[PDB]
Design an enzyme around this catalytic site. Structure first.
Site, PDB file in Angstrom:
ATOM      1  N   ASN A  58       0.827  -1.181   0.000  1.00  0.00           N
ATOM      2  CA  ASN A  58       0.000   0.000   0.000  1.00  0.00           C
ATOM      3  C   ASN A  58       0.873   1.246   0.000  1.00  0.00           C
ATOM      4  O   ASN A  58       1.276   1.759   1.063  1.00  0.00           O
ATOM      5  CB  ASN A  58      -0.981  -0.054   1.189  1.00  0.00           C
ATOM      6  CG  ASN A  58      -2.007   1.087   1.157  1.00  0.00           C
ATOM      7  OD1 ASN A  58      -1.943   1.966   0.309  1.00  0.00           O
ATOM      8  ND2 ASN A  58      -2.917   1.090   2.126  1.00  0.00           N
ATOM      9  N   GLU A  97      -5.306 -20.583 -18.003  1.00  0.00           N
ATOM     10  CA  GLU A  97      -5.675 -21.269 -16.771  1.00  0.00           C
ATOM     11  C   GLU A  97      -6.757 -22.312 -17.068  1.00  0.00           C
ATOM     12  O   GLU A  97      -7.955 -21.987 -17.131  1.00  0.00           O
ATOM     13  CB  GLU A  97      -6.141 -20.254 -15.698  1.00  0.00           C
ATOM     14  CG  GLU A  97      -6.395 -20.977 -14.341  1.00  0.00           C
ATOM     15  CD  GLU A  97      -7.614 -20.491 -13.594  1.00  0.00           C
ATOM     16  OE1 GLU A  97      -8.594 -20.023 -14.222  1.00  0.00           O
ATOM     17  OE2 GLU A  97      -7.578 -20.599 -12.347  1.00  0.00           O
ATOM     18  N   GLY A 120      -5.905  -2.210   0.404  1.00  0.00           N
ATOM     19  CA  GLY A 120      -5.361  -0.946  -0.034  1.00  0.00           C
ATOM     20  C   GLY A 120      -4.069  -1.060  -0.820  1.00  0.00           C
ATOM     21  O   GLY A 120      -3.452  -0.052  -1.120  1.00  0.00           O
ATOM     22  N   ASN A 170      -5.585   6.489  -1.778  1.00  0.00           N
ATOM     23  CA  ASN A 170      -6.467   5.923  -2.814  1.00  0.00           C
ATOM     24  C   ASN A 170      -7.179   4.649  -2.346  1.00  0.00           C
ATOM     25  O   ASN A 170      -7.822   3.959  -3.140  1.00  0.00           O
ATOM     26  CB  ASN A 170      -5.697   5.686  -4.123  1.00  0.00           C
ATOM     27  CG  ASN A 170      -4.570   4.683  -3.973  1.00  0.00           C
ATOM     28  OD1 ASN A 170      -4.542   3.886  -3.042  1.00  0.00           O
ATOM     29  ND2 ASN A 170      -3.615   4.742  -4.898  1.00  0.00           N
ATOM     30  N   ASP A 171      -7.060   4.323  -1.056  1.00  0.00           N
ATOM     31  CA  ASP A 171      -7.682   3.091  -0.546  1.00  0.00           C
ATOM     32  C   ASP A 171      -9.193   3.145  -0.810  1.00  0.00           C
ATOM     33  O   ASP A 171      -9.822   2.136  -1.135  1.00  0.00           O
ATOM     34  CB  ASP A 171      -7.408   2.885   0.952  1.00  0.00           C
ATOM     35  CG  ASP A 171      -5.956   2.552   1.254  1.00  0.00           C
ATOM     36  OD1 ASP A 171      -5.139   2.505   0.314  1.00  0.00           O
ATOM     37  OD2 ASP A 171      -5.611   2.383   2.450  1.00  0.00           O
ATOM     38  N   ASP A 194      -7.307 -16.031 -17.577  1.00  0.00           N
ATOM     39  CA  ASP A 194      -8.142 -16.644 -16.555  1.00  0.00           C
ATOM     40  C   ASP A 194      -9.161 -17.569 -17.178  1.00  0.00           C
ATOM     41  O   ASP A 194      -9.504 -17.394 -18.363  1.00  0.00           O
ATOM     42  CB  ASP A 194      -8.879 -15.517 -15.860  1.00  0.00           C
ATOM     43  CG  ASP A 194      -9.629 -15.978 -14.610  1.00  0.00           C
ATOM     44  OD1 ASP A 194      -8.978 -16.488 -13.682  1.00  0.00           O
ATOM     45  OD2 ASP A 194     -10.873 -15.846 -14.621  1.00  0.00           O
TER      46      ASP A 194
HETATM   47 CA    CA Z   1      -3.642   2.384  -1.449  1.00  0.00          CA
END
Ligand code: CA
Ligand code: CA
Ligand code: CA
Ligand code: CA
Lengths: 597, 597
Positions: free
Chosen positions: A117, A338, A142, A122-123, A309
């Protein structure tokens, strides 16, 4: 709604392999307009209308004579006019010829939310649906692009040459947004990670430190909060008319002589889960959209390759076309699919060059080697078995099923399964055997962030949160910091040291990257194999027992050719080989020898 | 030895495909002789001598113009003259074109010592090394050809069309002679079973009852008490100079890109156990001997095919030539090899028509389907798993790996594995599922004697004696008698009746013999599949749960096409199919429907 709300792709390039470019334009009544443009080398093909008045598809043919520059596309009708300045960028030198990840590389995998983080601010981003909660196992913690960039020297220092983050594209869900696998905007980095430009910077900073960047792409599905869902581009954009109909996951149904079409259709059109609408890739507009979007990311962000994916959950014919298109742009690229199966035949089916019973053709270069990972995890955990390593040897013997087994990705673990150390029963000596194996097999090795300090998880069932704990040192205030080594136990540090030792060594071992392999049948859970060419032999020998074992070396003479001894890279000691190899309990040696004539 | 002690083969036939015949002659100083003969169409090839004075190998070329009759072979040397009157028999009408066992057949398997003791007087034979002991699990119990013949009506009555007895060839060992897998004389029936002529009569009596006879042959090894072992025909006749060197059973080593020669050689040359000297099939004299001996049995005893023991333990090049030779003589024959692996790729490698990565070519028509048997046994035993039948479905999906999966032998069990009923956890309802499966798959079904009355065994490990208990009714004085029904429980009788019902039904269902198969992915341990062609659909549905299950029939409409109902062949009950299929706990239904347009 806004004039032009979305233009996709937002810009393109002069000099691509495929001349065609299909723009998906979205805005109120934009479908009621007619497009016009004037730029040498670019031809406007002429509308193929859709019933939805809010979308327009514009078909361009960009000739080899088209030059970098920009031009207006003008949309006229209903007595009004909209413009978009369209840019054709110049390609970086060597773009088409870019070298994909390969046998010489080692890939470090992260989940960007759970790694570092670098910017707590910006979390949360104003307007988005989920608030961060580091204390929730399925929450946003985060981690971001800044944090990842901050620690590129760590990753390079460990001996890794490629970075694979799970998806960074916008996932604006109310919960479980952290994982990235339910995109709500394919053309935008989730603002909680950073900007599109930040992602490009990640690629450029990684490249400075000798590392490629592999993007994780989902083709089969999106998130239910994707802006499309508010106003479906066409009634058949989403499978089953936009309504939730679950897949039952019959993956063999697409590659089974006895298959029911119901089961094949259910696999490729069925919704993975209710919050993940399934894209109808039989609609050519959807096929073009995904193909162009992934090319756009590779070109824009300078990627070394992709990890794809939920591979077989996409329409089979779409996958044929998609792989052909991607590999036509970038012939040296690697893409690793995958296919979640422990059955070698099932995985092998998808690899380029495979002769399939049903004539299925693919340009996919690589797959994740679940069969071999599963085999070794079984061997190291079922310690009461007399000869558990036999499962690894026999699985490896099936490599002839793959056109290019050397191009498959072998991994210590990943974000979908039990932590490597836990799968090894928290047995450090057996864990060492797994690590040696990973770094010496004729494969492309991949390693999951956190395994280098022996992070643990549950082993039973499926428990995502336990596999995805925050990296120690990624958050301000962390008591232990694996980046600096602060607060590591002696065993955690010993693990990290061994990863750094082996991965850096591996970078310099052409015999591992492209030498031959000769293995011997395991006997009583001891296993000997060699990587070899005329310049070097590497002899790996494992004693998967809590008792010493002695192996007569006469057995191995076609590889040893009378070598009296060699130096074990792990311990630095000289190991006798003249008549017998004496292995201590739970030991592994990596004996380095001269070339084999 | 005494004049000419052994002449092998002892007689032959006019009009075989391969014109060459190699006689292996044994006797005191016979190697010191030279052979001569005069018979129209028969040419004597100039001698090739071996250092052992007690053997002579005589090469003949029998032209197509050679008529049935006899000629003297004279052996001259050292002032003495020895004679042998050699006979060329006329072949039976249609001999070469004999129809081998196939998909329309069902095979009943016995061990002759353990089935029926028709003649107590041959339990011991004066001169032989082992005394009979009915109470010893590894002893001779006294079963014989007379006993087998006595009960052919019973076997044919159950609906079987082929009889496979484990080897009847002489096994004159001091211990464990009963099983037949350590031959001491390849040209002689063990006198405790009866004579060569009795074996011929077993074949003709079976034929009168609509049954073929399939002989069990060992190619890789002999018993330590074989007369060869007293005076080795050549120094290299037996692998490792006739001294015990064990195999470590690395079966994949003969078919592995990473194989060590040490391992492949150890598999094909290594002694199975100390009591089983390994034949060196890279010696052309050993190769010729085996090929000629097995062809001799086929022609002499009127066999419908062979079952070939320990298949991959023989030299790979020898196997290509052996299968070529046999299939050349009898183009419609079937031979089923025993490759003991639960891995589809490992078994499939050996089947005629397979394109192998190493170019290995085989003419073997069939193999034992251990992978599919293993899969169903897992599904039925693992009652704690939510969807164990998925293992069967996915194994079946791999049938494209076989050139001719419908020619593979699928079995309820055999003499080397836990009893079928024990494998089903003694759950009659799950046993019924296994039986229906066996009788409806696109395979050749084989059934192990005793399973029709739910004989039980141990379940774990290798416990031969437990799988080989005397057939009840086989011995005078038995108080349970499966031939007459005396002493059987209601459940044992119901099992027997159901085997009879399904096997006789199967004989008359061409759709099972050569129809298509469409199966559906199992969901929550329910499974639905169809055999189908223009004439018939046969629907199988099973519910491997102790609670009822209701399956919407929308799912199966590509096969059902609106069928409102059907009759279950098993219970005779009507089963609704309109909108939902209601399955009782632990049920299996078999529904016949008209063919699809
Ligand atoms: Ca962050
Ligand atoms: Ca899909
Ligand atoms: Ca007897
Ligand atoms: Ca052998």
């Amino acid at each position: 709604p806004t004039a032009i709300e979305h233009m996709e792709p937002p810009f393109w390039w002069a000099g691509m392999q495929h001349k065609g470019l299909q723009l998906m334009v979205h805005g109120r009544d934009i479908g009621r307009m007619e497009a016009a443009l004037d730029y040498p080398g670019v031809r406007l093909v002429s509308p193929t209308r859709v019933p939805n008045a809010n979308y327009l598809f514009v078909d361009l043919e960009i000739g080899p004579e088209a030059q970098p520059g920009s031009f207006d596309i003008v949309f006229k009708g209903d007595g009004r006019s909209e413009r978009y300045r369209y840019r054709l960028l110049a390609r970086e030198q060597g773009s088409a010829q870019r070298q994909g990840f390969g046998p010489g590389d080692a890939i470090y995998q992260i989940m960007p939310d759970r790694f570092a983080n670098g910017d707590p601010s910006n979390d949360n981003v104003a307007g988005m649906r989920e608030q961060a909660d580091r204390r929730h196992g399925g929450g946003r913690h985060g981690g971001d692009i800044r944090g990842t960039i901050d620690h590129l020297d760590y990753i390079a220092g460990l001996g890794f040459t490629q970075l694979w983050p799970t998806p960074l594209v916008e996932n604006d869900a109310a919960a479980y947004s952290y994982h990235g696998y339910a995109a709500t905007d394919h053309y935008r980095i989730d603002p909680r990670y950073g900007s599109n430009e930040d992602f490009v910077r990640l690629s450029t900073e990684a490249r400075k430190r000798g590392m490629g960047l592999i993007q994780d792409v989902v083709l089969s599905h999106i998130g239910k909060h994707h802006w499309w869902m508010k106003d479906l581009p066409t009634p058949d954009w989403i499978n089953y008319g936009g309504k939730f109909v679950p897949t039952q996951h019959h993956r063999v149904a697409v590659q089974d002589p006895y298959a029911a079409q119901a089961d094949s259709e259910n696999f490729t059109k069925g919704w993975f889960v209710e919050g993940m609408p399934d894209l109808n890739q039989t609609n050519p507009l959807v096929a073009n959209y995904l193909i162009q979007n992934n090319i756009w990311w590779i070109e824009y962000a300078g990627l070394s390759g992709l990890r794809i994916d939920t591979y077989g959950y996409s329409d089979g014919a779409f996958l044929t076309e998609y792989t052909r298109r991607l590999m036509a742009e970038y012939p040296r690229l690697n893409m690793v699919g995958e296919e979640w199966s422990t059955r070698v035949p099932v995985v092998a089916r998808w690899q380029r060059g495979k002769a399939n019973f049903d004539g299925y053709t693919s340009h996919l270069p690589s797959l994740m080697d679940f069969p071999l990972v599963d085999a070794m995890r079984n061997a190291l955990s079922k310690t009461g078995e007399e000869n558990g390593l036999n499962e690894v040897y026999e699985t490896l013997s099936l490599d002839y099923l793959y056109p290019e087994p050397q191009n498959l990705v072998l991994f210590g673990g990943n974000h979908d399964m039990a932590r490597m150390f836990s799968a090894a029963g928290e047995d450090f000596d057996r864990w060492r055997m797994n690590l040696v194996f990973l770094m010496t097999m004729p494969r492309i090795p991949q390693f999951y962030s956190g395994d280098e300090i022996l992070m643990t998880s549950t082993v039973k069932g499926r428990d995502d949160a336990s596999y995805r704990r925050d990296f120690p040192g990624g958050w301000a205030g962390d008591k232990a910091n694996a980046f600096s080594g602060a607060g590591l136990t002696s065993q955690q540090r010993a693990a990290q040291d061994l990863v750094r030792k082996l991965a850096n060594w591996r970078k310099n071992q052409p015999v591992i990257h492209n030498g031959r392999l000769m293995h011997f049948g395991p006997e009583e859970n001891t296993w000997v194999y060699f990587r070899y060419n005329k310049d070097k032999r590497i002899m790996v020998a494992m004693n998967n027992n809590d008792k010493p074992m002695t192996l007569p070396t006469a057995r191995f003479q076609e590889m040893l050719k009378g070598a009296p001894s060699g130096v074990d890279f792990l311990s630095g000691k000289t190991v006798g080989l003249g008549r017998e190899l004496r292995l201590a309990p739970k030991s592994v040696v990596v004996i380095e020898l001269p070339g084999l004539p």
